[PDB]
Amino acid sequence: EIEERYQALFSNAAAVKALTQVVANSLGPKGLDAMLVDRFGEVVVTNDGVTILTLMDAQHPAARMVVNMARAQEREVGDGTTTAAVLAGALVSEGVNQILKGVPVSKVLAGMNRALNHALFLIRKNAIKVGSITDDRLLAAAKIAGRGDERVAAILRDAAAMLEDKLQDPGFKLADLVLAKVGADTTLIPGVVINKSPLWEEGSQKLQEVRLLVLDDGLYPEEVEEEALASEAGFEQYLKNQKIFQENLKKLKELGVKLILLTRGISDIAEEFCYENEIMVITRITQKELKRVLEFTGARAAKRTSLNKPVEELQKMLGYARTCFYDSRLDFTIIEGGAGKATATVLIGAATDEVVDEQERIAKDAAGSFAAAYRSGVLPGGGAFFLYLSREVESLKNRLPGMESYGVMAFSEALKVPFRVMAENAGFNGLEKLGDLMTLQVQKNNYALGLDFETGEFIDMIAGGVVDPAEVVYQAVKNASEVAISLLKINTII
Amino acid sequence: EIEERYQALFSNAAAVKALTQVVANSLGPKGLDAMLVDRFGEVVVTNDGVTILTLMDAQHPAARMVVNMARAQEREVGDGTTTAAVLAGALVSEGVNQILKGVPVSKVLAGMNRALNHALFLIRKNAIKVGSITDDRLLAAAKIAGRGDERVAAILRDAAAMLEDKLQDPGFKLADLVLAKVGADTTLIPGVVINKSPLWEEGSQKLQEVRLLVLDDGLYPEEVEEEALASEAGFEQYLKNQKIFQENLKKLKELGVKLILLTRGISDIAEEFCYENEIMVITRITQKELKRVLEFTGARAAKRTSLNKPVEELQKMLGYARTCFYDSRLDFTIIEGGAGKATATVLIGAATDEVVDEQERIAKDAAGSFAAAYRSGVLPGGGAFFLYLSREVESLKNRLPGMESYGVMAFSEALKVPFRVMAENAGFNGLEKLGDLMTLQVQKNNYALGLDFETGEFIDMIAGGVVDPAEVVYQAVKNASEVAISLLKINTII
Amino acid sequence: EIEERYQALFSNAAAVKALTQVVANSLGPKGLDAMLVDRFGEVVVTNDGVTILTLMDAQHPAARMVVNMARAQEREVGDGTTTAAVLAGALVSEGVNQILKGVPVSKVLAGMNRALNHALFLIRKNAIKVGSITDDRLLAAAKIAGRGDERVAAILRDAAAMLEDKLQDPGFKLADLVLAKVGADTTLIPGVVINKSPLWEEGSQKLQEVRLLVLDDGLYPEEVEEEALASEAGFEQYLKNQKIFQENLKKLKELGVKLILLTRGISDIAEEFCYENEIMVITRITQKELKRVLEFTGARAAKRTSLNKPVEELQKMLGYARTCFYDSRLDFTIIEGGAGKATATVLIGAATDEVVDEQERIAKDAAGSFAAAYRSGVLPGGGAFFLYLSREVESLKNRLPGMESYGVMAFSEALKVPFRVMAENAGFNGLEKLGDLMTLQVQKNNYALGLDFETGEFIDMIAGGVVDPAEVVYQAVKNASEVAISLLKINTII
Ligand SMILES: Nc1ncnc2c1ncn2[C@@H]1O[C@H](COP(=O)(O)OP(=O)(O)O)[C@@H](O)[C@H]1O
Ligand SMILES: Nc1ncnc2c1ncn2[C@@H]1O[C@H](COP(=O)(O)OP(=O)(O)O)[C@@H](O)[C@H]1O
Ligand SMILES: Nc1ncnc2c1ncn2[C@@H]1O[C@H](COP(=O)(O)OP(=O)(O)O)[C@@H](O)[C@H]1O
């Protein structure tokens, strides 16, 4: 009859475990996978964790409170979300075990934050900063998210090299430098690209000294309500506007415009006019492509209505853009020599329109990895650094008194969880390889020793081309710990 | 068959306890959060008790009769609600023990009232007056109820020091003098502020001898019914009201106006007029800001119809307000040098627009506390003074006869409950620490000893910078006692 | 159907655990008692472990095999059996936990052995040897086993001073030099004593230069079969034997004998003869008294046939024994100044012939304790050294490879068990006290800090006058370890 006082806590834990016990199947390079079902019998097989974190039917409030945290992680990295997830769940489950033994909650948390703060603090000092831009460690940082095609790693690396100065700019994501096209040849372009064919085509074509205008709109004349097409006067507005459209066309041919970019379609009047005035134009671009060409050229976003300015303000919304080339043998457009910022574009080849959507995603995780690796610093992957963390946390067991000492230890052993799982995924005896490795680390005084989950032999992870970005690990730990804490702060349910 | 006679009592008690066992979790510096659910599956995690009191499905008459009390105190105090709640539940629970043991109900209540009265008298007599409006005890009094935040303490101290004169007016609450701004800097301002930019902005600008008028409205021309605009007379009348509009605008430019304040919009014609006459304008301000500037400048609130006043009685409804300055690099407006009373304004800095609504919640708890701190009367917090109360109540056990004597005793032990819970919230053995402290107070004869619920060693709460205001505890006790009384006077249910 | 392969393990474990869970209640100075039943409805309340180990109806093979260990240590030491019992049971439980976790058996035990060896190594090396025999640490070593009779301690240490040289023969027990007697005065006697009144009363009487003969027999004439009294020749041989008996009596009166010692009865002729020759005699003494006086006087044991010796072996078969005194007002006899071995005699006072039997029980364990304390040296009691052991064993957690490391840890935490129990017997939060003491010990680097299970204050145990003998702890740990080891090698039950 004493169960109620501890009811709620368990009520949460059982749920949390039930979640992580699933994602654990998919963790690590030789992770497994999970199969989700919607009531309509829809079937999905994911091997990536985040997908499963998103799609799994988990209505339990706790699980939700883990999911929100997962969302809080995907916003910052793209890789190593599964890590903080599993870590959270373990911290919860094996965390509560000490509370059940008789250690009161608040005094558990009290030691746990100590463990956390200390963990981060040591991550800071141990975050291996590069001091280079050519380092192989970065290339590998892209490789692991890259899944190991050093081609992608190389081109992304060279690309980031070309723009090292704006790697200091928080208003910049490297992931944006990638657009993939089917059957292309994996390479780099020192400018911005638009994956489209121009309005009228007659083979690969090039223009120089490009005066261009960009529009977040389409090229039709100004509209008035539809009912007004039955009022004759509205018709007079129609003819008048028909005049002012062409007038504005001449206003464009006045300033020497030779190129036009639109997000929609084009009127026949415009098509004919352009056909006559040697001005090239491309339609239906992405709002993101819009943003990129806008930033690169230094132009101003314009629409239909901004045609009424008197040619004097026209020189204020234009673009340049040193050179421009459309390839018919490759079916796309290249803009180079912008007078704004200097973004490039990395293109990746594909087979069908299937892989073509994933290649850029891999590019995103790669570039993001590289970005945080160059910015933040690297820690050894393989879950190996978590072990150094583990023992160096366990150390506080007897440096600070109180029952807090227990909580700390709970934290400590929890940090051991990742590696084992990976190993136990790759088919190893988790305990043998964990104990052997954790013993090995001390007897070699190296926190970088870990396991190649393919051979079975232990190697140096940095030399294995296996590392993680500092901030990724840092904020993974940071969020996961706090969601755990704020989960065990729960006492009751109504 | 005599179990029936007491039925109702349990029906209430069992409910009451079941409620309070939750709120105790929220008491004290290391309280535990609770997880509430609405039947639609709505989820919430709260840590302060008052929040928890509301979503909890408690249709039970007793529970309702406690909720009403808590809500009734937060309406009248603001701090120490969790406390009086728990205390009430305790008086009920430890109250019934004597009734079941064999003490008749009325004879319980009768002594309980006596215990109450004595408690009150002792709170009054032992209430520590400040006599130094600058005293550190007050600053701390703002700190612990606030959340610490030594900035707020400082600014509040400066505010109360510069304005000690209005601590004698009971028709005034200090807490409303706080407004927070995103990215601002926690400081004190000797005037009234509006956190928005005036009608035309460029740089930080200041004007002197400010002629301002206040309006609980906006600057548009006079409106007429939509049907009445279909009578032709409505159009020319529209011209007419526009006429009286222009007349009144010129009537404004007559008086030397340099500033305008509105709670609504502005006519473009009017805006043109103001732009033409070097007149500054602010729109859609807070009504609280309205009232504050109204008091500060000594002006009178007026609206559009009072524009027909003949410029000479209009000159009496105006304001000044010696100086007024808008800062554009911080985005707000400050008015100082009113010729009426001289109220100030406390400014609090923030990170984002999320936290921006929460700091006022600490500020209200802070300032209000300080407000009650000069008014009162400081007592040691930590629930530490309650034990002195307890024992000094137990003293009456054998100086007064009757079975009434029993009721009193119950009362005494009830007072011990808060501290106890605090301890077992902080993860200490409540009975042990209570036992140690209650002896310790006698062996040092100071009612100021309590326990640091973080370290574990006992200190003077005054020396810990941790105290509570008198009046809050006074009516907290009075109310909790009174609801307990009206709860145990219950015999039956129909 | 795969559960059947682990059946035996729990089948034993549950038993061992259930036993030690009982004996633990009684462990330590504030241990509790248990109420044992014989089927006849006989009731027993025990507080000492050994009693409980003996009377408890525990037929389960494992439990029996623990009883065997208790029997095996109490027989070889006398103190510190309860400890090794509890420790054993703990080793069992925390042993199985890792198997349940997944650590395979053999790879656990193999290293557990390493843990043992290192533990022993620490017991040897850290044993503070005395080198002074007068050291207070020894007096205390007797004190803790003594139940707090500084008299017993003092007299024992002074006695040991008298025999520091003969403490080296293991064919000697110091505990035997103590016998307690009703209404006596707790003191030391420089000889061997016999607590009986001789066949002669005269008042307190003293004799010197005693030429004495010792007999593992009685003073009867030579006996002949009752049937042989039907053979006539037996009558005259009986008379002749009656003659030779008195003849040898004269042979005794020849030698200047003044004292006679018998283990059986006395013939009437012998009795009269003895009365006539001023010779004092006592009958039916203890065999232990027999051997000790045999060692002391240097006399030789004799029987019936050795009356036929030709006046030649009598001068060598006698005893001496310089002085001898019988006190009738204290009711016993004292022999001092022997030319043989040099045993002394410690006498302790008592109330009735009941307490006189428990007093000797305190005396034997006391003397034994002191014996091993001088024999090997002392280690700190209070279960305090087991924690040092715990940590210094834990040091091997990452020092040794293999899946084995984990097993070591179990060992470590097992060593933590005693203190906790002690504390939780004394009514403290065991875990809290561990958390405080285990840290306190490291940051002060002394393995001698522990807890006074009365106050709550921590003290130095050697400075607290509370210690254990080295060899005792050594072989206690050794035994518990070996029984645990030999218990977990069990696979099945048939
Ligand atoms: N190819 C690999 N070799 C060794 N370790 C790996 C490899 N890939 C991933 N890991 C380890 O798995 C963990 C998570 O990898 P990550 O790329 O972040 O996947 P996720 O984003 O699913 O967590 C990291 O700690 C990393 O060290
Ligand atoms: N740091 C602290 N030191 C000492 N006492 C404290 C501390 N924090 C809180 N307390 C005590 O605990 C109680 C805090 O709860 P309270 O502020 O009344 O909750 P609420 O404001 O929701 O009513 C107060 O009675 C105060 O005396
Ligand atoms: N007054 C005391 N202060 C500190 N420690 C004590 C005190 N009394 C007993 N102990 C400790 O309690 C334990 C007593 O158990 P023990 O005498 O070994 O039981 P047994 O000898 O029957 O196994 C010893 O380790 C001793 O150090």
Residue numbers in the entry:
A (entry chain C), B (entry chain D), C (entry chain B): 9 to 502
What do the authors of the reporting publication say about this deposited model?
Here we describe the prototype crystal structures of the bacterial Group III CPN from Carboxydothermus hydrogenoformans (Ch-CPN), an extremely thermophilic, carbon monoxide utilizing bacterium isolated from a hot spring in Eastern Russia. The subunits of Ch-CPN assume the modular structure consisting of an equatorial domain, an intermediate domain, and an apical domain. Like Group II CPNs, Ch-CPN is a hexadecamer consisting of a doublet of octameric rings, its subunits interact between the rings in a direct rather than staggered subunit to subunit fashion, and achieve cavity closure independent of co-chaperones. The closed state with a non-hydrolyzable ATP analog and the open state with ADP represent the conformational states of Ch-CPN before and after ATP hydrolysis, respectively.
The crystal structure of the ADP-bound Ch-CPN shows its fully open conformation. Eight subunits are combined to form a short cylinder with inter-subunit interactions mediated only by the equatorial domains. The stem loop of the S1 equatorial domain is associated with the C-terminal strand of the S2 equatorial domain to form an inter-subunit β-sheet, which contrasts with the corresponding four-stranded inter-subunit β-sheet in the closed Ch-CPN. The N-terminal residues 9–13, a β-strand in the closed Ch-CPN, assume a helical conformation in the open Ch-CPN, explaining the disparity in the number of strands between the closed and open states. Two short cylinders are stacked to form a long cylinder with ~ 85 Å in height and ~ 160 Å in width. Although ADP is bound to the AMPPNP binding site, it lacks interactions with Ile152, Arg155, and Asp373 of the intermediate domain, and Asn55 and Asp56 in the stem loop compared to AMPPNP. In addition, no magnesium ion is observed despite the presence of MgCl2 in the mother liquor. Although the binding mode of the adenosine of ADP is nearly identical to that of AMPPNP, the diphosphate moiety of ADP assumes a different conformation, which in turn gives rise to different interactions. Overall, the loose binding of ADP, the product of ATP hydrolysis, facilitates the product (ADP) release to vacate the site during ATP binding, initiating a new cycle of protein folding activity. Notably, the β-sheet is the only inter-subunit contact in the open conformation, indicating that it is responsible for allosteric communication among subunits at the onset of ring closure.
